[model samples]
Target: QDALVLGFDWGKFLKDHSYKAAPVSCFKHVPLYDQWEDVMKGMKVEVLNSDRVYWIASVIQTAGYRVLLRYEGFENDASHDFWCNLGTVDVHPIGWCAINSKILVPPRTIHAKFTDWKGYLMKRLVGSRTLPVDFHIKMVESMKYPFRQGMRLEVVDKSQVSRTRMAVVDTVIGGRLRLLYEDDDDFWCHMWSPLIHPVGWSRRVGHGIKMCDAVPYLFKKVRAVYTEGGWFEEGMKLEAIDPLNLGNICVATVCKVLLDGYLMICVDDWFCYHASSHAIFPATFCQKNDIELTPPKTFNWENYLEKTKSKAAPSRLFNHGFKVGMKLEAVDLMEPRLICVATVKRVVHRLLSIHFDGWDSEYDQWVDCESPDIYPVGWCELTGYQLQPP
Candidate 1:
């Protein structure tokens, strides 16, 4: 076995041209561990069929938090089909009615055939599958705080974090909360989102309140200073691993700093990341790894850290002690529904160069160590994920 190396002028190449990084806050983390992600088409679910009653339903299709459901035993019914977030209050696991003493509203079509709701449920479950009790618990646990429509709140104005605005909960879908400001400027955040403050936050924090006749409430107070979330200041230089490609740890700099723990990081090869991502490394990472810094530029790492008065990302987040040739299960990015056997081909900082067992090397991938797409070797079996055979 041998290591692979590439010689490229990353420094001169980036200096000659301009590069762009997406807005920091918009970069979403992979939702590999989202609640109810194991629910799939053909699985039977207990969902509300209007009038606040639980009815037997089947998940027609699902993506992320959203699910399209149709009433079980109701054939080809287009009028009643609806979509909802699986984590919403409307969804439930089977047998929940029995424990909660709630009635199971049977489909009208099957009413005459089965008078006994218990017998009907038993018959329906003969070949179909219901979600495990643990999944329902996980779903409930996922939502830490709750909000409802028409509730008043005080929220931070975008771009001007120092000011508080009076806002109303316009809509509440799952954990997503949409707040309508006085001037009709709509903002969206979670129920316990740090951007939202209680009605008296402006008074407590000594920040001025903005336009509106109304107020916000509940939840812990936020740290007023942005830099309080570790000393990541703008313009600090550091080495970083590739967020997409494998085996390249290059020089990068903090291009911009934004609120909510986000920093814009640009690589010497012109690639970029929201530095909150785990791909970034300390300035000394290359020196310790015996790896060549692509673009081969002289950088004063320690001096830069001192001049910027910023701290490197805490070392606890890197590597996760991955080793080459270790076995694991990884979801192929191309076919996200299938989990395949994979091996760690290389560990470059927080990035793992992954090779699907028995597949061509052309299909190899590089993934962040914290990526949800990967799991322990037996994860597919435990989670009921479809394991693709090589």
Candidate 2:
């Protein structure tokens, strides 16, 4: 028996922008809100603040095709794989024939309520012409996906306050000889970790992995600042971190600091748990490896946008639904020598207003619009491609 089952015109629901747009959208302005003056005055340490966005590098927890279903009102007589959390869950594709099959559990799903179950329907209408999923690839990119890595964030000049105040040092803790930093008297902030190996504790269960000698680290001291409400202090607001009780670590050197309140740790970004207190340094060293620090090399907004437009061809695509009068942050990827803040007065697709620091002069400039790319606070990544009207 063929039947037409309908409720809220689900076809229209599929074309809705809510499902197609990014699930967890956050606006990041560039030219970081760092204590630029302090960084340059030997009172602070220079840091390549990866703290701009508190994101976690995804590691495969458990892989395998397990049945996921949805049953909100009642558990009795439920449906199978009705919805999936695309934001939180991550699935990597290895072989073929698994396109859109490696399902991701979105963060919103886990945060869903019971009484208002309408959200469940929206999950099913995710993939469409705008948000297409290649079934053969199996791995659908999660909208809740945080900013990608290798994004460019050029270091500020050592002369500028951005890099001055960051005091770099070396300290040995717990006989493990680790590196870390001290922003204040009480706290010892550790930026990176070289004391523990990947899954060293896990390895200890079998082959007895020996503890390392010294761990490298980095940190910066930030004084509390006066905001609209009150003074704000730059502290590690660890969003989702685990504790690795490896005896105190060390911090080596202080690299050039960005406007953001983070250090350009030699190690990757995941080792945030090594901080004993807030501003102490672990043993660290920085000789500027072959790694390029400026505008990340992965910057190809033109190519990415062009391909997206050609494939989807939407009548209109709003940029994260941005509007005027909202809390705006300035992004400066160009490594601006000066520092300032402003409001978004006029937004016409491209140009924006940046009210100068306590002056009538405001810069109405074109903003490079590309997310998942590197940005400071007010700056953005732009290409000449989209300017060429289709």
Candidate 3:
């Protein structure tokens, strides 16, 4: 009660209070019929000066004023002043850029129906692929399955996009065949899908058959052929095609040297491959894959080797020194652009098997001590790349 006697200091809190509230213009005033017609017929007026005049005029001219638009500098500054009530769904709010500081880009002029919008949305959401929807394959007057299981066929490894790989039909269910990659269990696909092809499909089409990634580790006992000193060395950058993404060529670092004449390379810090087949190839590898070398080549093998002279290969039997639960950054081999937070799952001497956090173990990879794909924590931030959150 005594404290209340001192007053609540309301005067100081509300000090310098001055306020005014004005009524909004309800757009009741109608322009003369001649002026309205002039605007409708695309009349010229002062740019950026006629928004209020046209907005009120448009509202009074049409009962459905919600659809009317007052846009300026839409396509050209000289012819911006115009009233458009038709196709108003495409219209944007007045001064959209000034209000939001974002430049608006209009869609292409086409017979854009309602259904086309969802296709656009799907493209934006799911990205693009060479795969075709089933609609493209129509049954000619009958639904039938002439193909049988246990048959061999050349099929596009949608797993390895835009490339054909051999698969055997393991099971025939419905119109599709459950394809099993020969010696490579990593790839399985439906037979009826457009991604699948007939036997000798690569030869008939004049495209090479790219062996699956699982093949080398499974069927081949080929070892890296080591040389005391040769064209290949550790730390030399080379242009190589990731077996995962046979579609394009990217930068790769010589990360490991094995007793069997092969060099383990990390491609764009995304996936690793051995120097067999098209995995690690010459500068012509990009052209061979029919994909233009993106970001262009800064230095070829000889130039790269010259710039940074032969660096010593990591000790094959040396320990990687990583804990099972320690966090690091690793590439998602399938989606090469992603650099995800990964934890060391298993440490077997020099081989540190790491898997991405918040993902399945199927995505994990094993690397040696100096593997380019694995980096210490905070490596993404240090390199100006965004780190995937846990």
Candidate 4:
């Protein structure tokens, strides 16, 4: 009992930190390696308890075998084996390997040198990349979004494990775009995201497009057709498929008219779309498409117009007065919390199509002169928020 009585903080050593240990083959020349081998054989012959053997192996693994040296006396007397193996530190019960055959791996010693095991880890382990301070950029310093609806871009397909996919701008909100997969309806992307890509992106990078996991039969490829008609006017009420809620139709209003007959329709303050007439249908068009329509009782054209008119700033249609490279701050539609840097990508009929800097057109947003989300330069500093970097 006296000979077996040994105490070491095995739990603390194992729990201290994660270690990327070397394989067992690397310990062939470690000090007392031969002695440990012999002890392993004896433990199998004498100590039949697997639990005790496992404990011993685990302790040795935690305290990796590394030579501790000391420079004492003088330069001529300096030695590495000064206190090679302390009685309690180096002692291991005879049969550790038989029960826990793969427990111990060599310490990573070639690139590290220290007097103690913990010292080596503290000096060699890499630190995390996260910074110590919070984000400091103000909302006013955030870049503006210069994007257009119906623009094609490549994005990361979140539906798939790890792949890029082809998608188009279904709609633009704040600083993000509501993305729709060219071929998959069940797939969608979030605001201020990292999952979008450009056309031919997947093929160029040698990756396959990951389609949405929804039922295969439920997805159909519908090409939006722009129809020529006088009905493509602002403030017109229509029923269209809510891009966010596929397979369900909702009442939306033509919020703005864009170039080439593209309509910016607003379903609610939070949801909007950039659809062509082919994608939009009149109040009677729902029944024609065989899709259910959910509309308010007895449409009120006059009342609806007044409500929209109040929310809209004075129209500055025809030369809405935006420049090509002017910069401003805007709310990211995809990530409302993030104020990004934006630029005027294009302007159409009192509408300023903005693109977010540092991101492709996949994150463009459309805003009007009076929209509350967009702001003049230096607005963030005045409002007490940090600005985002371009």
**Against the true structure, whose TM-score is highest?**
1
- TM, every model: 0.36, 0.19, 0.24, 0.24
Backbone steric clashes in candidate 3, count? 8
State the lDDT of candidate 4 residue by residue for 158-217, as single tens digits. Answer: 444235566767654433356676773533333323234455544544445553222222
User: Considering only N, C-alpha and C atoms within 3 Å, which residue pairs clash in candidate 1?
Assistant: 153-216, 154-216, 199-216
Clashes of 1: 3
What tens digits encode model 2's per-residue C-alpha lDDT throughout 289-354? 121112211523245335433221111211134445432223221222222233444343432333
- lDDT string, candidate 1, 85-136, tens digits: 5544557778787788888776665566555767756786797767766664
- Give the TM-score (vs. native) of candidate 4: 0.24
Which residue ranges in model 4 land beyond 4 Å of their true spot?
1-320
RMSD of each: 16.0, 24.9, 23.3, 24.6
How many pairs collide in each candidate, listed in order? 3, 80, 8, 34
